């Protein structure tokens with residue numbers, strides 16, 4: 112079993128590097144963030160441009176959807192996060208507290224909390240309703256590259272250029288696990304698997320690893336791509352075959368068989384680093400996006 116991802120749509124409109132793309136949980140929309148300071152919304156199935164959401168004073172590094180698909184949160188170089196009502200375009204809250212670039216963000220499944228990571232080396236947990244910072248975690252000793260909640264929101268995983276992945280108890284703020292791998296290369300991305308049992312981590316030595324995070328055992332290693340500089344997103348694809356998907360600094364999207372670790376497809380089309388990929392929640396659809404020399408977003412579809 113290999114997939115047959117093929118290019119269907121190219122989405123042009125951002126005027127600087129794209130930073131992040133994410134599908135809405137309801138499957139209807141794709142949200143994109145950029146160094147051009149904008150968020151754009153696009154149809155998930157047809158790539159049709161929907162609207163621009165503006166307000167940040169500097170470039171945006173990440174964007175994330177609430178579980179009901181009504182809200183977005185964005186993370187900016189302006190040291191803030193913003194919560195947006197997507198339909199109205201309204202900025203509902205500006206989350207203030209970080210003392211340097213906010214790099215990454217996510218809602219919990221309940222979507223009453225937001226987690227953020229920053230160049231200030233901290234992770235913050237925020238109340239969606241009030242915009243108040245509830246906890247500041249002294250998480251890392253270098254910039255925080257990614258933050259993600261597990262399936263029931265009881266855990267947060269964080270990654271950092273300090274070379275560590277840490278697991279945090281959402282309720283207490285306590286550090287529960289530090290994952291250590293030899294030579295401590297910068298960790299440029301991390302997230303939980305959809306079931307919550309594993310985490311997938313990227314390091315800046317051209318390597319992705321699937322970890323059992325309780326046992327601290329590395330179960331799989333994925334290689335063949337290029338990643339030595341940029342914080343590139345990676346994914347589990349679960350709508351068809353069970354794949355791992357990532358961008359790459361050679362301008363390709365890589366797809367691996369999760370079990371065997373073989374590369375099953377490489378998607379050609381982008382003309383600069385593929386910084387971000389996302390997998391549609393119900394259909395075999397991948398979105399990908401590229402840095403400044405390209406600036407486009409691509410939608411790819413497979414029969415499996």
Ligand SMILES: NC(=[NH2+])NCCC[C@H](N)C(=O)O
Pocket residue numbers: 128130131171172173214215256341342343344386
């Ligand atoms: N959270 C992320 N991994 N965002 C994408 C990287 C964005 C970053 N500002 C860059 O251009 O390198």
